[PDB]
Amino acid sequence: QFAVIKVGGAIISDNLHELASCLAFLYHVGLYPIVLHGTGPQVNGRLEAQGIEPDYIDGIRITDEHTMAVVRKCFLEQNLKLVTALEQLGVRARPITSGVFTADYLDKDKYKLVGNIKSVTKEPIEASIKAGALPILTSLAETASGQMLNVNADVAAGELARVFEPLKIVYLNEKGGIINGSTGEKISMINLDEEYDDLMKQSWVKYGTKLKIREIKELLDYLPRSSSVAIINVQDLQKELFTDSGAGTMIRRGYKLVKRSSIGEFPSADALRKALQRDAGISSGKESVASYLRYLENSDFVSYADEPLEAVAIVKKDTNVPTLDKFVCSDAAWLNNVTDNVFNVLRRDFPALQWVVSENDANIAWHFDKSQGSYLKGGKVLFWYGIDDINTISELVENFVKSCD
Amino acid sequence: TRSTVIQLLNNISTKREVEQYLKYFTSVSQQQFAVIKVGGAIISDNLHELASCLAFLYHVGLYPIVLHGTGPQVNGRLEAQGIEPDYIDGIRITDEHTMAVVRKCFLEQNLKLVTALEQLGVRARPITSGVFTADYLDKDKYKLVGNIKSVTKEPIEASIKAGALPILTSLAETASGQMLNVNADVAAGELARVFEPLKIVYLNEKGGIINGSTGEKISMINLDEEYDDLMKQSWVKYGTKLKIREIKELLDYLPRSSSVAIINVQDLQKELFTDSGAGTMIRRGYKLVKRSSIGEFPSADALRKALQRDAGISSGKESVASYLRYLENSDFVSYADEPLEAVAIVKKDTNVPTLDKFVCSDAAWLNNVTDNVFNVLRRDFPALQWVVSENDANIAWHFDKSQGSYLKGGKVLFWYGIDDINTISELVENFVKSCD
Amino acid sequence: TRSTVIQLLNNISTKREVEQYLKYFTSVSQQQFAVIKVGGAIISDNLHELASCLAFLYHVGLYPIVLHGTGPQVNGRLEAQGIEPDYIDGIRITDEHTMAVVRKCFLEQNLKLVTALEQLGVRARPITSGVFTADYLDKDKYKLVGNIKSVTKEPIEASIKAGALPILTSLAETASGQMLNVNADVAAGELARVFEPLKIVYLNEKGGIINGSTGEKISMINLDEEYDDLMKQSWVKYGTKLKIREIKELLDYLPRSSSVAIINVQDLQKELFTDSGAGTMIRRGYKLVKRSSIGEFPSADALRKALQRDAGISSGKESVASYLRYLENSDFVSYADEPLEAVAIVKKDTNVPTLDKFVCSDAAWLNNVTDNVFNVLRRDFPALQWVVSENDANIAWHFDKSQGSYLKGGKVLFWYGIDDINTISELVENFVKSCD
Amino acid sequence: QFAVIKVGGAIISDNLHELASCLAFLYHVGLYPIVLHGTGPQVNGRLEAQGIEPDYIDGIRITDEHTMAVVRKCFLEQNLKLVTALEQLGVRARPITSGVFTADYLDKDKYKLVGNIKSVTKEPIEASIKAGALPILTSLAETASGQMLNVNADVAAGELARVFEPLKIVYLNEKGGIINGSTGEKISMINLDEEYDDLMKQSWVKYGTKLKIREIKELLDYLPRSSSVAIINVQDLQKELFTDSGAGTMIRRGYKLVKRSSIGEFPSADALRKALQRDAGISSGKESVASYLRYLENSDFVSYADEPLEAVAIVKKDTNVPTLDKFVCSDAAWLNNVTDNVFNVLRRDFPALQWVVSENDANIAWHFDKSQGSYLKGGKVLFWYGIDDINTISELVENFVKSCD
């Protein structure tokens, strides 16, 4: 499912065209972002205009009875503004100003009419998408009994992400990305699994940053590995959504390969079976997975696979210059370069390696790029890397030719 | 669309239907089109009937504001949870828990209709809040029941402007943001007051109003003429009196162009454009004014204009000029509305009085002011004769109002109420005598 | 679209129009709607008029097969190349060179129309060959002129199926592949024969046929009844005689369902569905068969089934059984079409004969076989009386056929042709006498 | 204009979906190919079905009076079949079965009702495209007087290409190309200026082939040197339309390459020097063309150059496994695969060859495809072909490594 985009209210006032044209682009290429917005700046100006002092404790707006009336009006206006904007560019939008979030009071005497989201109702957002309209949500919850409660836009966004498990979660701000405070290096990427601990330890990472990165981790720990969070400025949005660099920060968990040395260590032997069935010489070749796995049990080998076994490499360690014996990766895996991931790991753990690919394998070109040498014979190509000993090359080639037997 | 045309044509029979449809499509006026109050019962039991019908209006380019309740569904749920549904004074005592059931039902019923319509290619836009603001009607008597203080146009407009049907729930909310339950029929009226739409359709089960003393389905009511004497009737029940009263009160506020329909769901497409349909259509109309001398007409020139549309004066061999000379010296009774859109003149000499002139513009034909005038005539003149051109546009209508007819020289003699075989001969003979 | 609906509704007046329109939208529809022969003169001088009009049909979901000539354009070119245009027997002597000019013109005229239609949003598909196969008509008399041996449907069908109007040139071709010039009016007939369309419209400049002695646009012609006496007329010019004759010859080949319209381009949308329009519509109409005894009816059971549709026999208190008893011993004339879709019975006793039964199915009403039957009646019975129920479905129609009417006891006495003041009294008195 | 695609009739019978869906894709992305189809088999199948020997001289069908009737019927059927197919997939198609080609008799007694296209009328094809419909032409001409004449599909296609000068000209066949009928070697390139005469002289080149290649030469003699024809299989159509490689036979005019063995034979020594100055290691590299040509004079070498010296290849013939020493081709040449031209000639004159390409040359992938083996070192890749002696490979690699001095 595609994206949840949290829009700061500031943007609807000051960049309606930039924003609208950009969502319109997504709409045009057939993508349907769930859009959820606040209304910060606008509201304080109105409360002043009516002689109400805007009022906060703990970074939360104390939303009393009168203030709610101003807040509600602003939400609804800001929300049509965006919908209208989008319609003008030919994009079907559907304002959804209630009926998505249900909440309790966060603290009835501290904050008055501020909410705490207890659940998300999908049906409106789905209906909208199904009917070919972008859904444009206000971050406004409501008790069962029907009192509307003001609720934090950033937390609403998260609650949606949790339910809809979208691929991208974009937080549109003014600032833009995150800047490394000690070198000014705009941080364009963060792989949490690797980088998180040492980033939180940094002198420069301010408290506000720590809390943001932490809350992003907490979100991403349960969504798919496919998902990611982007902190960008509005203009460089179209860019950051598909290019991994862009000009904003993109955070994600970062992907896993698991090194195993025995069938024993695989959590499901049946998962392995399915994984191996996509092979060119097992899918109906003359070697049943059954009997192949027999040979493995009694074999010096190292395997590398992601959790879903979308890519499985197997290095047989006998014969100096070990052989990459199987490398069975689904198309899904090729497109997300998990294949590059797996070779990178291989290249570090096996400084010399040989393998064979069919002369007209779909991505023979790729293999060539990863090799240091190639030899063609009988519609198969021997590839190897890291063995620039003139002599062991001869050995290698000779054995390969020997086995068109 | 083939689709639309087929369904248009299914719901036409008389030309007077065709002429009314045409008039709604060549509304050059960006006056607002219609508010349609839909009982909740209909969304459960006739979603297709209703949706296809709204879809037709959408297709022909008309954009009804649709406002719906949720009555039946809710009581069934409260029972299902072991809560007694609870009313005082015909109002639902909507406590905290009950509101939660009501709100859920509103939102469901509402998507149900929007989704339905989308499936048929109609852009719908659910508007479940932000239109009606209310106070509490009485906070300890009714708890969370509202009283509508105002209506916010922007959502409904924006929707229409962006090409989507707006589908409103009848659910108000205090400034502070507590949703209050509010009567669907009253909400419909408050919209109508603010948007001054041309049609206000109230979908019910009953259908129209039936004349309890003759079974004559009452298809039309011009209040300015008919209201008083209709309320005076033996057969008219209290429930009816209250409905008609509340419709008068509404239409007194709106333009003369506007009108209210009470119909059943199935005959909806029909009653929205055809003046007859199979339900009752109320509107203000104008009152007919009985006068007995040119003196009493406020504008003599207005009279002259009125009479010039005649088939035998617009260039026939009796100038209105000379006719109005004869009138001044004549025993006559006249009937016309204020705008002289319809004028009848009965010359009272000769037993069996002659309806000497009867000249109504097309406007008048479509709003059956013609029927109004004949009804008055039929009461004030139990026997009457009159002559219409052989190929008058609505010669058929005259035939229906007559008890007998005679054709000669491209004119038809019509009469009613004189079934004496003999005075008929006299009548016919004099009429023939005067083609020379 | 509002656009279309408006233009549909502009061209409706009677319900009989509405009911015909409905039939065409739920007809055989698509393939079998109509063949429209367009004179080439029109593609040069009225492309918009024509295009917009076809476009309207396309929009309400109808798919006319359009077949055009190229007359004028081609002579202008042949002159422009210094070739004399050349005819014997109303056929163009199409030699080798002249064919090249004819072919070029066909193909141009043909795109011109398709393009024009596309520009208005109508999918069109030029079909410039592969429909008609022909022999030489006479190789030395006419050179490259053809004689249509057969019509290949597949292209025309495919086009309609894929939602495009087919635009045919009238250009045949031998099996071996030499193109032969073929008369557009004859081509149109050959299509009609294969596709049995409901309408065959011949677009001309002239317009319809105008009664040269009263200026009365002749809007309808039932050939089986009217043909002989029309041809006998002083005013019917030779050119008219030849056209009507050639139309009879065509319609004698096609179904009874079929009909030919001779109209001008502008009143096309109108004449295609409305039975009046402002052009002449010809059709064969029906052989009504005059019988004077039950004996002569080919099936007595067919008669009984025919009469059972009556309002006072379908469950009224006079069984068809006993009615037919009374007929056997009765001076009567009956008129019925072959299918007994309409059956009229005139009881001949009592001066002013009575049309005693007139039992016509709805099918019959819509195809005005009822008008047929009355036309015959009117000729064979110069004075006639009849009684119809006050609320018969088409009481209005009866009124139009009468010269006088009297209402009593929910029945209307109608008569025609007796404008003797006195025998009218007699007539009315007897009628009143028999509600008791 | 985008492309003319000649579709063999065989394809409409055996791959209507493959073909239709593929054109449908082009239609969807807003491209409008002119599609011209034949009707070969279907017609031959009928003539057999009626016991008539299909009858050809010179690769042309002797179309008598009856045989034309069969042809015409088959054209019209095959043509709707394709239009209908496309419509079903949402693509507006417009059958154009006449009125595009006007012809004389090619030879009235040799071929009977076969035509010779005297002109092509654009207006129908343009109107169709303008009106948003794919035009689907039959290759069927007609005399001024209106006799329809049969015209080879391949020749009609050339006549369109001539008039419309489309960017791509695709000839869809079954083979996937032209396969050398005596060795099964898929011919991937044909430079007509060099190869044409000796290819037509071949035993295996069937009469149908001769007529297609001839009509392609005639076409390409009219058009720019930039233009070319691709004869591909249906599945690699989407591919060949945007990728410059794709994979079937690609024909084009090329230049006649001139084999010289001494500076003496070059008509201008100054023209040679200019040609070599575009090199990456002479344009300001540490080996002046001046001194390089000194070494050549005293060198066993073969050179190959077109007349304009847009491409110059130099094979140094010492050391078994000769070296392609210089290969200096302007960008113009690269884009028009003069590199393919030159390799074809090389492969015929030198059954074993070695050469070196930069690790990140723009078309390193191409070189890999032309090789039988590769070795990477010091940002250069050694390539060779035709030497599968395990031992001389060692020699080869060792010397190459030796020379990163």
Ligand SMILES: CC(=O)N[C@@H](CCC(=O)O)C(=O)O
């Ligand atoms: C044109 C001709 O003489 N011969 C070919 C043309 C059809 C095709 O190219 O498939 C034939 O078989 O009739």
